[PDB]
Design a binder for this molecule. Structure first.
Ligand SMILES: Cc1cc2nc3c(=O)[nH]c(=O)nc-3n(C[C@H](O)[C@H](O)[C@H](O)COP(=O)(O)OP(=O)(O)OC[C@H]3O[C@@H](n4cnc5c(N)ncnc54)[C@H](O)[C@@H]3O)c2cc1C
Ligand SMILES: *[N+](=O)c1cc(C(F)(F)F)cc2c(=O)nc(N3[C@H](C)CCC[C@@H]3C)oc12
Length: 424
């Protein structure tokens, strides 16, 4: 039934060997669980999706890893209720293609579409529209959770069972296996964005641009971000903000099929500085999805009010010797009821660090400042933080652990991450 396999997160670090069940039969899955809750606890069981999480939340070395990608049935889409009803194994790319013809848009998209619905919920993923749409769990209207006791619970965000619902959202698969869910989609008349591009010269004007209230005019906003140049160049950004185009705004060629889809010498001179600023500055640019959308991935958010502390963390980063080219910055909006949900209103930033000597000790310092300044790290990007740091970052973890205690008293569900962060 099972196959012992060598599993890594997307970052390809910290491998561990687990027995991997990979069946489309919801029965075998329910039974493989009781075949684990019968032998005491052992090393338990964790669900796995498309394995895009960099962390170790979808590994369970010496235990059972259940691959959910065979469960990829889209059961129904309804354009009137905007409800979509899918198996946890369907990915967001599959789902986006199926829903477009109904005038429905996936409400939260991450930077890769090869992500299951299970994973989208379990990490409570965010995207470029967080400040307007919240994260993924805000759009889940119901889900079917295979619990440790073998029963299948129907959860909804309100009424009774809300607590277990909101613990499963961002629960990293540690309340049990999500089998099926209903998502409320976002209505759209096209598959296109209208985008305004902006460029900044300093971290100061980047913050100002995100504080002047202009942000309330776009549903989608993010930025490429300079983490290398010394001040005051440091933290200049190419800002890309937009919203879904109506049909009226499409060029005539496209207005027929609105829901479709398919380094030089100058580069560092004053001319390319002129090129980069000119090409990064635009208005009303219509773009499709793909146009608009040995390393250590590191992402954190700092509460909105601690802006000076945010600027200081950026300073620490560029003066650290560790250089990062791909940096995305965004202002998150309001959070949700999930105790372990990563997003809070404030300054979010994703950096990519070339693995080299001293990096591990340096990021441990970074952790310390992020913690100190009231922010947190993201489990879907994280493999190396500590339980003390995690627990302090997420003050509601105790609230969460209790809920999990009820629904899995015998530690049927476990992972490399749960043991490391002491969420088990
Ligand atoms: C290039 C790239 C860009 C990314 N951009 C973003 C981004 O912009 N925003 C963002 O939030 N994230 C981003 N991510 C991270 C990614 O969206 C999340 O880690 C996501 O959870 C991955 O989904 P998955 O299906 O691969 O799940 P996996 O990585 O296989 O599993 C992740 C977690 O979900 C749990 N899980 C999976 N299936 C189930 C289930 N059926 N029931 C219960 N639990 C389950 C697993 O146990 C594990 O804890 C990015 C990743 C990559 C590689
Ligand atoms: N950071 O990794 C990050 C953050 C955000 C958001 F704005 F939502 F906060 C969005 C991201 C995105 O859309 N894509 C990516 N990637 C980075 C550069 C590393 C992995 C590749 C993708 C393109 O990151 C985002």
């Amino acid at each position: 039934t099972t196959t012992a396999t060598r599993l890594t997160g997307w970052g390809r670090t910290a491998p561990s060997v687990a027995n991997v069940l990979r069946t489309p039969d919801a029965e075998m899955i329910v039974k493989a669980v009781a075949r684990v809750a019968e032998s005491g606890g052992g090393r338990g069981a964790i669900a796995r999706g498309l394995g895009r999480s960099y962390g170790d939340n979808a590994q369970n070395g010496g235990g059972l890893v259940i691959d959910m990608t065979p469960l990829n049935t889209i059961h129904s889409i309804d354009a009137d209720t905007k409800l979509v009803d899918i198996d946890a194994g369907v990915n967001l790319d599959q789902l986006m293609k199926a829903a477009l013809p109904f005038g429905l848009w996936v409400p939260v998209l991450p930077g890769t579409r090869q992500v299951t619905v299970g994973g989208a919920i379990a990490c409570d993923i965010h995207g470029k529209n967080h400040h307007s749409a919240g994260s993924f769990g805000n759009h889940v209207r119901s889900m079917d959770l295979l619990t440790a006791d073998g029963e299948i619970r129907h959860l909804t965000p309100t009424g009774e069972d809300a607590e277990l619902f909101w613990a499963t959202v961002g629960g990293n698969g540690l309340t049990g296996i999500i089998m099926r869910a209903t998502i409320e989609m976002t209505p759209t008349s096209t598959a296109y964005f209208i985008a305004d591009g902006d460029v900044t010269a300093s971290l100061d004007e980047t913050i100002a641009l995100h504080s002047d209230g202009s942000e309330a005019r776009y549903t989608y906003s993010s930025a490429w971000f300079d983490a290398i140049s010394a001040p005051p160049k440091l933290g200049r950004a190419a800002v890309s903000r937009g919203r879904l185009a109506t049909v009226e705004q499409l060029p005539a060629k496209l207005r027929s099929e609105p829901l479709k889809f398919d380094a030089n010498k100058y580069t560092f001179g004053p001319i390319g500085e002129l090129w980069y600023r000119k090409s990064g500055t635009y208005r009303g640019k219509v773009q499709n999805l793909t146009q608009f959308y040995g390393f250590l991935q590191y992402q954190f958010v700092i509460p909105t009010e601690a802006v000076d502390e945010f600027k200081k963390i950026i300073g620490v980063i560029q003066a650290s010797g560790h250089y990062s080219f791909l940096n995305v910055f965004k202002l998150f909006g309001p959070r949700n009821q999930a105790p372990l949900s990563f997003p809070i209103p404030g300054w979010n930033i994703c950096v990519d660090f070339p693995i080299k000597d001293g990096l591990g000790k340096f990021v441990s310092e970074l952790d310390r400042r992020v913690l100190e300044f009231g922010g947190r790290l993201y489990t879907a990007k994280d493999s190396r933080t500590t339980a003390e740091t995690f627990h302090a970052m997420y003050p509601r973890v105790d609230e969460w652990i209790s809920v999990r205690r009820k629904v899995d008293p015998l530690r049927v569900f476990a992972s490399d991450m749960a043991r490391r962060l002491e969420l088990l």
